[PDB]
Point group: C2
Chain length 239, copies 2
């Protein structure tokens, strides 16, 4: 209908990438739908994020899957995403017909800060291929990464959701989905958290397969591993 | 002339705000001027920044002044900057003729992460006025801060250099220079670092009053305090 009168607060701890490219539409929709809920969002490192909902006052952790770190939280898979290579049109990569990771490792890289927004998968891929990449520029934000790629500092590696040809018309995007293993964005919370109906609403808005029932089943499992296995038959959203 | 053949590396540890709004022009100019220097830049927290040049491999720390943290580095003042209030045109602040900090504290705030990019001065100002601000949104990036201000999450407080009416035409900027004490961006390095001529070039490009002589005098002082006092007669750049 119109709006809910529900009343309460919703504290989110998340990353730049989620805050910037994944959440604004969800949050806009939620804000008009749930007028009397005080929404809070604090960008943090994956460590800070886990700490914030684990020890602090965040209700929800929204971040890409990071080891046994969200271990004592209820973690739910929301969507899969991967990386795009960003270069200038005059870059040797732009000419190259199919670009591999040995071709990519030839160049200085401009990408995410270590342990952020799935850097691990980039590192792991290089380790696996026995290659040592020259990472010269590092940041939390795809925007400045793009800025420095356009100055010729090197080859950008960002999240594909952080690119758009409409808003970055002077760049060349190369999909690296066959180059890196995909990353999974997860939503998480403390088990002791009483899940308000707006909390269910929000979760399902951000992750449609996560209906109230499914969420309730997941908390009943008491393993994040079993929770992820719940969905191994279905194709999760790709972003 | 054209270019220098000089050869070496330049490792910079800095913040988002510097990387995004203060450095790209300097770096572009430096990159064509100093072709054979490998430039590296890694965004980090003020803690990471200090650690990186203090313990790690960064040559230069570029960040706003942060206590006895850069204590065992050579710190040089580069420029002063302050904050702007960012709201939507239909915000009560936009109508208000002169906006004070008691008027501002009436509203939920969208600003920098704690201990970042001069948050302290915002906090200190609120403490001094005996006011407790409702900070609902926090981030390292002015861009997403602006994004969430436009959704009506609250009142933005960013660096003035992070705003432009040309590139953010649908926002209202209010200068808060009489509201917050200014912040000072500083450049810093380890004393044992041999200062290459490109390093002097770069420093002076970023901070014109910091000529080779002046820089050399500053290292001779062996106090960051005396170094800052060297310039107390002149007006530092304002950004």
């Amino acid at each position: 209908e119109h709006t809910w009168p529900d009343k309460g607060s919703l504290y989110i701890a998340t990353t730049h990438t989620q805050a910037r490219y994944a959440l604004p539409g969800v949050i806009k929709g939620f804000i008009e739908r749930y007028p009397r809920v005080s929404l809070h969002m604090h960008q943090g490192s994956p460590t800070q994020i886990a700490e914030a909902v684990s020890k602090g006052n965040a209700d929800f952790a929204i971040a890409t899957e990071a080891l046994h770190l969200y271990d004592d939280l209820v973690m739910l898979p929301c969507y899969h995403w991967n990386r795009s290579i960003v270069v200038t049109p005059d870059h040797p990569l732009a000419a190259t017909s199919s670009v591999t990771i040995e071709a990519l490792a030839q160049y200085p890289l401009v990408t995410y800060t270590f342990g952020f927004t799935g850097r691990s998968e980039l590192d792991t891929a290089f380790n696996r291929a026995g290659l040592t990449p020259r990472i010269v520029f590092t940041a939390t934000d795809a925007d400045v990464i793009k800025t420095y790629v356009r100055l010729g500092l090197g080859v950008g590696v960002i999240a594909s959701m952080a690119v758009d040809p409409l808003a970055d018309p002077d760049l060349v995007r190369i999909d690296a989905h066959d180059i890196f293993s995909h990353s999974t964005t997860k939503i998480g919370f403390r088990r002791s958290t009483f899940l308000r109906s707006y909390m269910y609403d929000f979760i399902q808005r951000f992750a449609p397969h996560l209906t109230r029932d499914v969420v309730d089943t997941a908390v009943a499992l008491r393993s994040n591993e079993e929770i992820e296995a719940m969905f191994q038959d279905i194709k999760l959203p790709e972003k």
